[PDB]
Amino acid sequence: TDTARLRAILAAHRGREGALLPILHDVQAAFGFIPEDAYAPIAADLGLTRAEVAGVVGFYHDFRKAPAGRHVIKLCRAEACQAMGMDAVQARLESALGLRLGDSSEAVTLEAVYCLGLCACAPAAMVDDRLVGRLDAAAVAGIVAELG
Amino acid sequence: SDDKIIRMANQIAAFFAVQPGDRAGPVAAHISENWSAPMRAALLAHVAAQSPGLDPLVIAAAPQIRPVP
Amino acid sequence: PPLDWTQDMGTPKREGAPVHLTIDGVEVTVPAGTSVLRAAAEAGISIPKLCATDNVEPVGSCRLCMVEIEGMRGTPTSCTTPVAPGMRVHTQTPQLQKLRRGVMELYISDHPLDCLTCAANGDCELQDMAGAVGLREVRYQAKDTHFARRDATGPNPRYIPKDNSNPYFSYDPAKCIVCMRCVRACEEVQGTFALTVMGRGFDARISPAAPDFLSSDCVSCGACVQACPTATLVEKSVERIGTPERKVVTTCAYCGVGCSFEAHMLGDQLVRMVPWKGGAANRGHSCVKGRFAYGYATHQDRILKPMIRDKITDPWREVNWTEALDFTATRLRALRDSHGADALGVITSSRCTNEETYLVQKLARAVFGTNNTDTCARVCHSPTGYGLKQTFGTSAGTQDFDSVEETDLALVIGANPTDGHPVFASRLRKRLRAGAKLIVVDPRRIDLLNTPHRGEAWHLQLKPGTNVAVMTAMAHVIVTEQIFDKRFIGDRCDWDEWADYAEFVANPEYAPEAVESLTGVPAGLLRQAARAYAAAPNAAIYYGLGVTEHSQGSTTVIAIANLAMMTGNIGRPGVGVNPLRGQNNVQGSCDMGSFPHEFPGYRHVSDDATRGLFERTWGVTLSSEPGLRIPNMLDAAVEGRFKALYVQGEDILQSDPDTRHVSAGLAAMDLVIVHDLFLNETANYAHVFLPGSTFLEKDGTFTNAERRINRVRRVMAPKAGFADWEVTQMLANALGAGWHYTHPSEIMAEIAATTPGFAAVTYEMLDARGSVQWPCNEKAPEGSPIMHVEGFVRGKGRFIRTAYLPTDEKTGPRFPLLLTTGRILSQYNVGAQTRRTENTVWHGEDRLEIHPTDAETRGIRDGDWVRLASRAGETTLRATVTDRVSPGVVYTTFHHPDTQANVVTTDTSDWATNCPEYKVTAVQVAASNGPSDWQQDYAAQAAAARRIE
Numbered sequence A: 001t002d003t004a005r006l007r008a009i010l011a012a013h014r015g016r017e018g019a020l021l022p023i024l025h026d027v028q029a030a031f032g033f034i035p036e037d038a039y040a041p042i043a044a045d046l047g048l049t050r051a052e053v054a055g056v057v058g059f060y061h062d063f064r065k066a067p068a069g070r071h072v073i074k075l076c077r078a079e080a081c082q083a084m085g086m087d088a089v090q091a092r093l094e095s096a097l098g099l100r101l102g103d104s105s106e107a108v109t110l111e112a113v114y115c116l117g118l119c120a121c122a123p124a125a126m127v128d129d130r131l132v133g134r135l136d137a138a139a140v141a142g143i144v145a146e147l148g
Numbered sequence B: 001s002d003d004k005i006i007r008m009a010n011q012i013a014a015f016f017a018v019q020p021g022d023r024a025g026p027v028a029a030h031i032s033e034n035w036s037a038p039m040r041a042a043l044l045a046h047v048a049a050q051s052p053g054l055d056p057l058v059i060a061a062a063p064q065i066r067p068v069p
Numbered sequence C: 001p002p003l004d005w006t007q008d009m010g011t012p013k014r015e016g017a018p019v020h021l022t023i024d025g026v027e028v029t030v031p032a033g034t035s036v037l038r039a040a041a042e043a044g045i046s047i048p049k050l051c052a053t054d055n056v057e058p059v060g061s062c063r064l065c066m067v068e069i070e071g072m073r074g075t076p077t078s079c080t081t082p083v084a085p086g087m088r089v090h091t092q093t094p095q096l097q098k099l100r101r102g103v104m105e106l107y108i109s110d111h112p113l114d115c116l117t118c119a120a121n122g123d124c125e126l127q128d129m130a131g132a133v134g135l136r137e138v139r140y141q142a143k144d145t146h147f148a149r150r151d152a153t154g155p156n157p158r159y160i161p162k163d164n165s166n167p168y169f170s171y172d173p174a175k176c177i178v179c180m181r182c183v184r185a186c187e188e189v190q191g192t193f194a195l196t197v198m199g200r201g202f203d204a205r206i207s208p209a210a211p212d213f214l215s216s217d218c219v220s221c222g223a224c225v226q227a228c229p230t231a232t233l234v235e236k237s238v239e240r241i242g243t244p245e246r247k248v249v250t251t252c253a254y255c256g257v258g259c260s261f262e263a264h265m266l267g268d269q270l271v272r273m274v275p276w277k278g279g280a281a282n283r284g285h286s287c288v289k290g291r292f293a294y295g296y297a298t299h300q301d302r303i304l305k306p307m308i309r310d311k312i313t314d315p316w317r318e319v320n321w322t323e324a325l326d327f328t329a330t331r332l333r334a335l336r337d338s339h340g341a342d343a344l345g346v347i348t349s350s351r352c353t354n355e356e357t358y359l360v361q362k363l364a365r366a367v368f369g370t371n372n373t374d375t376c377a378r379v380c381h382s383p384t385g386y387g388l389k390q391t392f393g394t395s396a397g398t399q400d401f402d403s404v405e406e407t408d409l410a411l412v413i414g415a416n417p418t419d420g421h422p423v424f425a426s427r428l429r430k431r432l433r434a435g436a437k438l439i440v441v442d443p444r445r446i447d448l449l450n451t452p453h454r455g456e457a458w459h460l461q462l463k464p465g466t467n468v469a470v471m472t473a474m475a476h477v478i479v480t481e482q483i484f485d486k487r488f489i490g491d492r493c494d495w496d497e498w499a500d501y502a503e504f505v506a507n508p509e510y511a512p513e514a515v516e517s518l519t520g521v522p523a524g525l526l527r528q529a530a531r532a533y534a535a536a537p538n539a540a541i542y543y544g545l546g547v548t549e550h551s552q553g554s555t556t557v558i559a560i561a562n563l564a565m566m567t568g569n570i571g572r573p574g575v576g577v578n579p580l581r582g583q584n585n586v587q588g589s590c591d592m593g594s595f596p597h598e599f600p601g602y603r604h605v606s607d608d609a610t611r612g613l614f615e616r617t618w619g620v621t622l623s624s625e626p627g628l629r630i631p632n633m634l635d636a637a638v639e640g641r642f643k644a645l646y647v648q649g650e651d652i653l654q655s656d657p658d659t660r661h662v663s664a665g666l667a668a669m670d671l672v673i674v675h676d677l678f679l680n681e682t683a684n685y686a687h688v689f690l691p692g693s694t695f696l697e698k699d700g701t702f703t704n705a706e707r708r709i710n711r712v713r714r715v716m717a718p719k720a721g722f723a724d725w726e727v728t729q730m731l732a733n734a735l736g737a738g739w740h741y742t743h744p745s746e747i748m749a750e751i752a753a754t755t756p757g758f759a760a761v762t763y764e765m766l767d768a769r770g771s772v773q774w775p776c777n778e779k780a781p782e783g784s785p786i787m788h789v790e791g792f793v794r795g796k797g798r799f800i801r802t803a804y805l806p807t808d809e810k811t812g813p814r815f816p817l818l819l820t821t822g823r824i825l826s827q828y829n830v831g832a833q834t835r836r837t838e839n840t841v842w843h844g845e846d847r848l849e850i851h852p853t854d855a856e857t858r859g860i861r862d863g864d865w866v867r868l869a870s871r872a873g874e875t876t877l878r879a880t881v882t883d884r885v886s887p888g889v890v891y892t893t894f895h896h897p898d899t900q901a902n903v904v905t906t907d908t909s910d911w912a913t914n915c916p917e918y919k920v921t922a923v924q925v926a927a928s929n930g931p932s933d934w935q936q937d938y939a940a941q942a943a944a945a946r947r948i949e
């Protein structure tokens, strides 16, 4: 059934100019990562080589090589968010979940994003497609509460 | 049980037939420029013996073939 | 001579207006786009570079070619900085020194100090640029590395273990600087994107998307290797053996492209072979076979001493030269007196030089007293030499391989250049990726069609045999419409004939709408392709064995030349009608006689004016009658009146059709000498044997497809003591001729004296110029890169009425499927040279590319054993289901003898040159277990015959 979805995706991006990125985006959105089982057909459709595809996949960060937990937590580690106390937040959260930075699981996945546009609302995060700001050491409780 | 020689002759004929102008002269020229003594002799023997499975063009072209010593 | 040859400049050569500049206070004049680095190279002032190579376009990765330029800010790169007039550049200041030292510091901070026990010592472009810049200290107490197996706290995750999956080179990333020349080469030069850069930053590692190189799309060709400076990618023969000292230029014994090499040598031991950056044929590129497969010359199975049998059932007997030749000549004279001189014959080898070729045809004419010689070209590209002769005036190519660079379209009939002629396909893809267009007329999806970054492509997947119908329909389209060039016709060709041709072709029976039934190709597609070909400014045709090896080959070639003349794609760089010659020195061979109807120079044998010249030159009476051809030989010997044969460098059994017949004809022969290296399938029916020499031991020339005469040099020493021309003269003098040659230069001199074209040929010329196109007389002294450039040879082209004759090998109930025989990249024709190498990896067993739907009803599965129940024989083979081929078509390969493939193949042949019908054979593929009745007996014979005493 995966092949069907993939074919659909490829058909949807037919004739476009430089359609590798969109196609990969969609492939990821579908499954959750770029399986090596799907490096070839993409190439076959686009006239590329498995290698080029894998290289593109490897370069960019937003293309998962392996799936994530049921929940995901991106936590800015940039300048501004750092300024208004991101370290402490990070510590509290990774103590709560027991998962350090970059370390994933079947349950959750904590990672970094390096900005979100919430540079005034300095301590910022993205939890499961929901943005959060002004993350003091209290809101983390609510963050974890809705998130086991 | 066709002779390889007859086959080749008929092939050459089949070709040179569609050509414009002299259709036998060229046949003879080719068979004389390309084939060897025993083969030419065999062919001439065939045409003289009036063997079947042979194109009339070759029959016409045989007398024009380079003679055998 | 040029500097490009010996020195690795930085960037490629550019064309443009002259531009003056001052590199480090030295005046230079060079084209516009040309870089600073290349100019500085041309001026002698060397600049530090690691990531810049001529093979490819430059990229600012190393940052070590930094220079101070007046009018610029900072320290820009020379690799990327194109010259401009009045530019003044400084190459070595204190600043630049400091920066370069810093960069190398950074490099080496992540490099192991395994110099002095690394393979590429003395040949690493990192080491010598680390000593150049003046590195003396590294200050970074590194913790994060790639080479270190053991980090702190445990193993290094970054460490990637070696990869020796490939049998010819090895990948040790521990020593990788990420210059990316490897990638750039596999993608720009070769054209198969097998390599990429996995990762972002320090984590960036070269990699093929696979566990190992072998599993990948990487075939071989060591471009990746030829370009890696840092022993990461390295040849194993350099790991085992040491790094070489000297270099010697030679050519490949394959493929007819003439890929020139320089053999690297450490004493007398051949360490490796690397392209030269010379020859218009290869500009520093190769394939696997030439680059790596040269180990047949050192195989245990090679034979080094003459042997005589006196009866095929009886075993061999290792014997010296003298008594062997005595026996030989005795039997020969006996037979010559008994059955006549016409009862003898030879078979020249294209694999051999042209000198030896000349000697052999002499031996056959001057000595034996006949015209019964021949060669491999009866079966590869004979019809060509008839059609192009009847139309233009030459039985040879039209252009070089540098022409393709200028074409705007490629029409490929019957060829698979990725396997046949790789290095040409590379240059083709280079042009395809640069906009050019492609038409392919094969029935079998070739990998040229699935090239990366391909432009537009049309594919006429037809039914084999119907190759003239399609051309006729193309012409019908062009004439029905009005797209052809009238100026060209009026000028370089005739008009009286053009009218007739047009009136013939204009018939609606030869229209695409009707042939679609028998052909299988669609109509609209054909019309489109025709319009596209006829519309383009500079189009070029490259054809091979799909046209020739048929019951209508000459006809087809003629049709093709007609198209080429109609459209006007002749007599110019970028256009022509190029046949892709195969074996090395097929062209040379055919040029130096090796045909039973001609003398050296494609001069007929009945020409008294020529026979006189040669009688005078050789001092002997010659024959005016033309000799026999191989099929004729065999039929004769079956019937009688043929008793002798001197087989030079050719396997008449595995590499010829109707194997049963040829065997029965080779057995009924009181004497059949052999002059190969190894014990071939032919020697199973032999009475005598003479060792030959490899291209490494030889000395002479090779005349390739683009008529280029590449020079072959001696690097090793003949293990059997004597090369092949030496042996030939041995035999001849032993018979009673009385030749005295001490060096083949004398022979080449003789040739230049006798035949025209080679009159200006001299070894010194080849050494200096580098190479020559054989039409080199006092006129066109440099050579003739392009034929028919000013009017045709006969004077006026000729239009000929072609028609489609239904082949006799049509299909029926018991032979429903068709058949096709072809090739592979790794293995050569019979693999006597190649099965004795490590190329049995990519291909160790011949397989049958069958179609699925044509298999389901049969019950075939990938890896299953099947039988080819044809008319002319039967064979067992392993299957392979693939949509490559069309339904009702099957594809086999004849590289392996364990499978007897040409036994299936039928006796049917061309009308003119009698080239066989290899590419068409009605067969029946079915499932089976018991191998066969023929293969068993064959193996029995071969085993009971290859035993020595």
Ligand SMILES: Nc1nc2c(c(=O)[nH]1)N[C@H]1C(S)=C(S)[C@@H](COP(=O)(O)OP(=O)(O)OC[C@H]3O[C@@H](n4cnc5c(=O)[nH]c(N)nc54)[C@H](O)[C@@H]3O)O[C@H]1N2
Binding pocket: C254, C255, C256, C289, C380, C413, C414, C415, C416, C417, C419, C420, C421, C441, C442, C443, C444, C446, C463, C464, C465, C466, C467, C543, C544, C545, C546, C547, C580, C581, C582, C583, C820, C821, C822, C823, C824, C825, C826, C827, C828, C829, C919
């Ligand atoms: N690595 C390697 N290199 C080689 C060789 C090798 O064996 N291995 N062989 C050497 C020699 S001696 C040779 S002859 C040369 C040239 O060898 P090529 O010219 O490459 O000939 P092939 O690869 O046999 O097939 C040519 C293509 O045409 C297809 N074809 C079959 N029937 C038809 C038909 O009716 N019409 C058309 N339009 N096409 C058809 C064949 O199936 C195939 O796809 O290469 C030389 N180079």
Ligand SMILES: Nc1nc2c(c(=O)[nH]1)N[C@H]1C(S)=C(S)[C@@H](COP(=O)(O)OP(=O)(O)OC[C@H]3O[C@@H](n4cnc5c(=O)[nH]c(N)nc54)[C@H](O)[C@@H]3O)O[C@H]1N2
Binding pocket: C253, C349, C351, C352, C376, C379, C380, C545, C582, C583, C648, C649, C650, C651, C652, C654, C655, C656, C675, C676, C677, C678, C680, C691, C692, C693, C694, C695, C724, C821, C822, C823, C828, C829, C830, C831, C832, C833, C894, C901, C902, C905, C918
């Ligand atoms: N079914 C089928 N049959 C075919 C073809 C096909 O496509 N399909 N192709 C046809 C064509 S394209 C051709 S070229 C033929 C080629 O087929 P072959 O005539 O078999 O040519 P090669 O494979 O080079 O081997 C010839 C012999 O010469 C030996 N030799 C190599 N180098 C030297 C040297 O330097 N000196 C000496 N004295 N000997 C040497 C080699 O070891 C080898 O044993 O096959 C033809 N038959």
Ligand code: SF4
Binding pocket: C111, C112, C113, C114, C115, C116, C118, C119, C120, C121, C122, C124, C125, C126, C127, C175, C229, C230, C231, C232
């Ligand atoms: S690749 Fe070059 S610099 Fe690196 S260890 Fe080997 S010889 Fe030394």
Ligand code: SF4
Binding pocket: C182, C185, C186, C190, C192, C194, C195, C217, C218, C219, C220, C221, C222, C223, C224, C225
């Ligand atoms: S050997 Fe040739 S095909 Fe293989 S990776 Fe290197 S450049 Fe590419």
Ligand code: SF4
Binding pocket: C175, C176, C177, C178, C179, C180, C181, C182, C183, C206, C224, C227, C228, C229, C230, C232, C233
């Ligand atoms: S493998 Fe060799 S050529 Fe490729 S990036 Fe590494 S050092 Fe450079």
Ligand code: SF4
Binding pocket: C252, C253, C254, C255, C256, C257, C258, C259, C260, C282, C286, C287, C288, C289, C290, C291, C421, C422, C423, C424
């Ligand atoms: S492309 Fe042909 S000539 Fe060049 S190395 Fe390969 S086999 Fe030899």
Ligand code: FES
Binding pocket: A076, A077, A078, A079, A080, A081, A082, A114, A115, A116, A117, A118, A119, A120, A122, A124
């Ligand atoms: S810096 Fe984290 S929000 Fe932009």
Ligand code: FES
Binding pocket: C048, C049, C050, C051, C052, C058, C059, C060, C061, C062, C063, C064, C065, C066, C077, C078, C079, C080
């Ligand atoms: S030196 Fe020009 S960029 Fe590497």
Ligand SMILES: [Mo+6]
Binding pocket: C379, C380, C581, C582, C583
């Ligand atoms: Mo060939």
Ligand SMILES: [S]
Binding pocket: C376, C377, C379, C380, C381, C581, C582, C583, C586
């Ligand atoms: S050939």
